[PDB]
Amino acid sequence: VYVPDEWEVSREKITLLRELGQGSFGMVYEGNARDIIKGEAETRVAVKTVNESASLRERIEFLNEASVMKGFTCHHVVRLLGVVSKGQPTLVVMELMAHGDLKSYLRSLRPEAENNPGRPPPTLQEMIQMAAEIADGMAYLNAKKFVHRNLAARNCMVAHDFTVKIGDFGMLPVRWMAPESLKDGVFTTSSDMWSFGVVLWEITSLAEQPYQGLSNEQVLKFVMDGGYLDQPDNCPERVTDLMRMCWQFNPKMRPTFLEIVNLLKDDLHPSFPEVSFFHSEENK
Ligand SMILES: COCCN1CCN(CCn2ccc(Nc3ncc4c(n3)-c3c(nn(C)c3-c3ccccc3)C[C@H]4C)n2)CC1
């Protein structure tokens, strides 16, 4: 049972512009929110909805996810801005990530891409920046005692200034799963580290399908036998080294998300210590 609180916004303050794509509970829209953030007259938003066919229990669960998001204040995790519980349909207002999911964004930077924005593919500097941003958001989730369980490029988001953030998470994708998860169903921050390595592989391959040519049955056998992804053509050695650390068979040998940020801290944008969880007073 959900009880309305301080975060609640009036229904008519949100104007929906267009559909973005299907979410877990229903359709996600691109919208504009009137006076949602202090100092901002209008804010570009992503509005999560519950579809008509869903149950009251499913509608309550959606609002309980919004209650959880209230305590999340990381710059590298997509933030909740407000909620609408009174009436029908149920709404959850998130910050808009202007360039959408990381997978779709990486595919658009390919030479053959019909929707190429006239920009080059990610530079080594940009790849390292993305890696640290994803790892910082994941370090924040881990400090919050949450295991993602579904980390992949399709789940990471790109902001207007190209900042990468963790989208929706765990409050089968066999090609991103750690050997212990494929075998025993064990999901931890260490299995999330394995998936992070696959995300790095997606960045360097411009969102190619992992283990292309191998079926879901062959991926399961290959990964559990100690097999891992081959490095993509012209992959920078620094990113390859990160992938290898992520792909250790024993989850105990894999680095932590904070250790990843610590390995990359010196080669980042000057704003990183001003916005990161790693450099915040919360990282203790
Ligand atoms: C040159 O390329 C062509 C131009 N492109 C066209 C596509 N354009 C990009 C469009 N875009 C999609 C989405 C989103 N921005 C966005 N911000 C925030 C969210 C979501 N989307 C979101 C949410 N749940 N779900 C499920 C999604 C979702 C993801 C991918 C696709 C659909 C929906 C909730 C929060 C996390 N922005 C970027 C510019």
UniProtKB/Swiss-Prot annotation:
Modified residues (Phosphotyrosine): Y2
Effect of V45M: In IRAN type A; uncertain significance
Organism encoding this protein: Homo sapiens
Record cross-link Glycyl lysine isopeptide (Lys-Gly) (interchain with G-Cter in ubiquitin), residues: K70
Annotated consequence of substituting K86E: In a subject with non-insulin dependent diabetes mellitus
UniProt modified residues of type S-nitrosocysteine: C74
Residues exposed to the Cytoplasmic side: 1-284
Gene: INSR
Residues that bind ATP: S24, K48, E95, L96, M97, A98, H99, G100, D101, R154, N155, D168
Name this protein carries in UniProt: Insulin receptor subunit beta
Outcome after substituting W201S: In IRAN type A
Effect of A152T: In IRAN type A
Occurrences of domain Protein kinase (ranges): 14-272
Active-site residues, as the UniProt record annotates them: N150
Effect of A46V: In IRAN type A
Effect of K48 to M/R: Abolishes the kinase activity
Result of altering A153E: In IRAN type A; impairs proteolytic processing
Reported impact of E180D: In IRAN type A; accelerates degradation of the protein and impairs kinase activity
Highest taxon, organism lineage: Eukaryota
